[PDB]
Design a binder for these strands. Structure first.
Ligand SMILES: Nc1nc2c(ncn2[C@H]2C[C@H](O)[C@@H](COP(=O)(O)OP(=O)(O)OP(=O)(O)O)O2)c(=O)[nH]1
Ligand SMILES: [Ca+2]
Ligand SMILES: [Ca+2]
Ligand SMILES: [Ca+2]
Ligand SMILES: [Ca+2]
Ligand SMILES: [Ca+2]
Length: 901
DNA sequence: TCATGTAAGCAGTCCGCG
DNA sequence: GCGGACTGCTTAC
């Protein structure tokens, strides 16, 4: 097999590399890598190295990496550019793996671990590590085993061995319900003392050294705790055995309002799953406890136990250990679904970076572009300092707040990457500038043509047309990858809808789910077999189709994120290729493209309708337009349609056969106007929206920019079994809105769009009457909590104290004296409830850690004093009033003359 | 919240507005 | 009471 790296590090003048050799074995080597850097050289002299602008360079070979680093410093002292890859390990990887890396995941040791630490005096701080580690569960992907290290004797209690037999049993048998599929994979090791446990753990670690190390909060908690606890008991040298090269560093992670410490383990790639989840999931959650995320992702119930976690080991060690094991498994289950580890490996090996660098689009693109240029013996420029400067972004149209009955939307494919490719925007393709007219002059096609030679953006920039820049070339590669996975995702989505339809008429039989590939549209034969299947088999197929869709989503959306990240990186001062001219060329071209096509669509539809100056485009944001289809429907007449699906088909055909060709003609003209390199402005129909045929539903509404709701029947070619609400920006979509309130507002919207005013009024009246019965957590607001200390003046709110911070200060007074009480953590999320006048907490609100029950000390008082009236007005009535006023609808029945009967 | 960008919405504080 | 200046937070893209 072809070799591939696992990890790479620079330690002084050595590269330390862990890798898989040609025989599939893991090896480690120390290489005295001699790096090269570059300086500009006279034009008259012969060389094969040129910078990105075609200026000749001489290569400088250094005796060692420290000499190279020192040379860069002296070049700064002199005032001359020191060119080349200054991150020598990237250069090492580029030299050692000068081909497209083919990796075998089965040879990569991925470790998932979690520790337990009993602490009687509050949260066990990793930097102090003053309490015994009393459990570690460490899953190894190569062995496919859960290694359980269990401390039986502690200063906080002596316990009996954990029983695998009890662990396996149902909760209803007094067991822990450790999933049957992992029972045979547990290797259980009890220990008489903590020193023995840790020494054995380190020996185990040496034998099975993680390449990828993951788990939940492992970077911020488990790793620093283990490192510091071992350091405290045995000394530094023993703790450094967590690094295969015996090198570690305390790394200070700084943010806007403070800093924290993590432990860098040289020769390991730490991908904390909480961080993978935050980057790759495209969710914003009210809580990031593993319980919460597991329930959200997997529909598993929270791990239930009596009493505080600080007493769980002594009261129920059996459950304590079982829950440690289950916690490790839940992360594996989330990854089986989301496939973020797979994604990280794909991206990392593609870029030729340390796998943990996938968190940085700047590092990722630096490596991709470096490798690409190196292939042509080209030399990358030195990174430079730049002041942070604001620059303009997208255009968003101000919508007229209203109901909108029939709507068809259209969207540009991968806009910013397409602009980069179309215009040929790259550091080395800048050709010059032209005299800019106001943007509206380009939009209306009255400005002078910018150039007859170069490819242009309306910010004034011109680009070469003779050859693609490295940015367009490399962005295209990832774009094409993204397109493939999006194809699989959408096929899985369409396949899911076939199954949903079939589930209306399930067969009374005993059968099995069909063995199919959900990434491809079901054949006619498969469709016929589906129509004969039982509900059990159909539901299993639906689950599998949906899992295939999620895998496709992960692969596609994050490749999209990577390419959009390149467009953003051009506007980040730390990017080697930072250039506000290029960053702004992209965004300004986007503004023109949207407004140009708004004009063209309005012109086209006014022609087919025989009107003048009518606005068909009701809204647009960045790359999408929303077109009122009322007049199109009315031209044939609603009574001509057999059912909802009939007019959806009609609009689908109208969009594809009439509007898209007109849109394409419009963009081809714009391409010619800007003299662009290649026409890549591809705007296709996105959504078809409207009320059910014959209903009193309003179809859709807008309240303002980035705030709307549509009842959608077809989305990018997926024809839904049941209409789907597309709601953007409204409170139903915000993590800050209480859970039960999101649900209620969504039903209000559903009724508005599908059923009408009377249905909405019926529901509102019921919710208002019953909502006080809702669980307090379900009606709590949510907020991130920053700068708690800043607004804390002697335990009370300082000037301009935010509402949620005031709530935290209230909580802090209520629990004062308790070392045991859950503390609110700076930067994390809290639940927030308003409090009635004259409550014993002495303020108008209270807040506590999100994803948790409020401590029993004050729970009863919170429940008694919760201000339901304020809660309802703020979270429910105010947003609903906004939706209904926009839609010209009443949520309460107005008096009429009939009331006199 | 260490980790690519800008546009723009709403909650809430402070306080003017005769 | 509501709107502007401002902070804080959160989405849409
Ligand atoms: N710099 C930067 N731009 C972004 C980011 N997210 C969205 N944008 C900009 C660039 C996108 O091309 C543009 C439109 O985004 P969309 O979500 O509508 O999707 P896009 O057209 O990129 O892809 P798609 O429609 O799914 O093919 O908005 C981002 O994270 N960074
Ligand atoms: Ca735990
Ligand atoms: Ca798009
Ligand atoms: Ca599309
Ligand atoms: Ca059937
Ligand atoms: Ca869009």
């Amino acid at each position: 097999m072809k070799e591939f790296y696992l990890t790479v590090e620079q330690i002084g003048d050595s590269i330390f590399e862990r890798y898989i050799d040609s025989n599939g074995r893991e090896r480690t080597r120390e290489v005295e890598y001699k790096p090269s850097l570059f300086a500009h050289c006279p034009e008259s002299q012969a060389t094969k190295y040129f910078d990105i602008y075609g200026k000749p360079c001489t290569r400088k070979l250094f005796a060692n990496m420290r000499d190279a680093s020192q040379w860069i410093k002296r070049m700064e002292d002199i005032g001359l550019e020191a060119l080349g890859m200054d991150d020598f390990k990237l250069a090492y990887l580029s030299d050692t793996y000068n081909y497209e890396i083919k990796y075998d995941h089965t040879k990569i040791r991925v470790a998932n671990f979690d520790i337990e630490v009993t602490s009687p005096d509050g949260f066990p701080e990793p930097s102090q590590a003053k309490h015994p580690i009393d459990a570690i569960t460490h899953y190894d992907s190569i062995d496919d085993r859960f290694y359980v290290f269990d401390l039986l004797n502690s200063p906080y209690g002596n316990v009996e061995e954990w029983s695998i037999e009890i662990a396996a049993k149902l909760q209803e048998q007094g067991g822990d319900e450790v999933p049957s599929e992992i029972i045979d994979k547990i290797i259980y090791m009890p220990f008489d003392n903590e020193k023995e446990l840790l020494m054995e753990y380190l020996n185990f670690w040496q034998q099975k050294t993680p390449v990828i190390l993951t788990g939940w909060n492992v970077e911020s908690f488990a790793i620093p705790y283990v490192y510091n606890r071992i350091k405290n008991i045995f000394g530094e040298s023993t703790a450094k055995r967590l690094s295969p090269h015996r090198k570690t560093r305390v790394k200070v992670i700084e943010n806007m309002y403070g800093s924290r410490e993590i432990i860098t383990l040289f020769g390991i790639s730490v991908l904390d799953y909480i961080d993978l989840y935050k980057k790759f999931s495209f969710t914003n959650q009210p809580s990031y406890s593993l319980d919460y995320i597991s329930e959200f992702e997997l529909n598993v119930g929270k791990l239930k136990y009596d009493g505080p976690i600080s007493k769980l080991r002594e009261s129920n060690h059996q459950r304590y250990i079982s829950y440690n094991i289950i916690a490790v498994y839940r992360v594996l289950q989330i990854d089986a679904k989301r496939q973020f580890i797979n994604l990280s490996l794909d991206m990392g090996y593609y870029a030729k970076i340390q796998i943990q660098s996938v968190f940085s689009p700047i590092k990722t693109w630096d490596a991709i572009i470096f490798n690409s240029l190196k292939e042509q013996n080209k030399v990358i420029p030195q990174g430079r300092s730049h002041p942070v400067q604001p620059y303009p972004g997208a255009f968003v149209k101000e919508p007229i707040p209203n109901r909108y009955k029939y709507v068809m939307s259209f969207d540009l494919t991968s806009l910013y990457p397409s602009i980069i490719r179309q215009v040929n925007i790259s550091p080395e393709t800048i050709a010059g500038t032209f005299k800019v007219a106001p943007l509206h002059d380009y939009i209306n096609a009255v400005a002078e043509r910018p150039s007859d030679v170069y490819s242009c953006s309306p910010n004034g920039m011109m680009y070469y047309k003779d050859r693609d820049g490295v940015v367009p070339t490399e962005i295209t590669k990832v774009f094409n990858q993204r397109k493939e996975h999006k194809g699989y995702m959408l096929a899985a989505q369409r396949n899911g809808e076939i199954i949903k339809e079939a589930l209306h008429n399930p067969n009374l039989s005993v059968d099995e789910p069909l063995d199919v590939d959900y990434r491809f549209d079901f054949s006619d034969e498969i469709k016929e077999k589906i129509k004969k299947l039982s509900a059990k088999s159909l539901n299993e197929m639906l689950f599998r189709a949906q899992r295939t869709e999620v895998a496709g989503m992960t692969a596609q959306i994050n490749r999209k994120a990577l390419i959009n990240g390149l467009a953003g990186a051009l506007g980040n001062v730390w990017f080697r290729y930072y250039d506000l001219r290029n960053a702004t060329a992209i965004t300004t071209f986007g503004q023109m493209a949207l407004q140009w096509i708004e004009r063209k669509v309005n012109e086209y539809l006014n022609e087919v309708c025989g009107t003048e100056g009518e606005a068909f485009v009701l809204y647009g944001d960045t790359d999408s337009i929303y077109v009122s289809a009322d007049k199109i429907i009315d031209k044939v007449g609603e009574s001509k349609f057999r059912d909802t699906n009939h007019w959806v088909d009609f609009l689908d055909k109208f969009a594809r056969e009439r509007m898209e060709p007109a849109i394409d003609r419009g963009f081809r003209e714009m391409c010619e106007y800007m003299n662009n390199k290649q026409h890549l402005m591809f705007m296709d129909r996105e959504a078809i929206a409207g009320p059910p045929l014959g209903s009193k539903g309003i179809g859709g509404f807008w309240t303002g920019k980035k705030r709307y709701a549509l009842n959608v029947w077809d989305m990018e070619g997926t024809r839904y079994a049941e209409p789907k609400l597309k709601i953007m920006g409204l409170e139903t979509q915000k993590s800050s809105t209480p859970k039960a309130v999101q649900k209620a507002l969504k039903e209000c919207i559903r009724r508005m769009l599908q059923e009408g005013e009377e249905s909405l009024q019926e529901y509102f009246k019921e919710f208002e009457k019953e909502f006080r019965q809702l669980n307090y957590i379900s009606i709590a607001s949510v907020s991130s909590a920053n700068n708690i200390a800043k607004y804390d003046v002697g335990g009370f709110p300082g000037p301009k104290c935010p509402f949620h911070i005031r709530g935290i200060l209230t909580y802090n007074r209520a629990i004062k004296g308790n070392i045991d009480a859950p503390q609110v953590v700076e930067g994390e999320k809290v639940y927030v409830l308003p409090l009635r006048e004259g409550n014993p907490f002495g303020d108008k609100c209270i807040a506590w850690p999100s994803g948790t029950e409020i401590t029993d000390l004050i729970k009863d008082d919170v429940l008694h004093w919760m201000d339901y009236t304020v809660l309802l007005e703020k979270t429910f009535i105010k947003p609903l009033e906004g939706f209904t006023s926009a839609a010209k609808l009443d949520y309460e029945k107005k008096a009429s003359l009939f009331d006199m009967f």
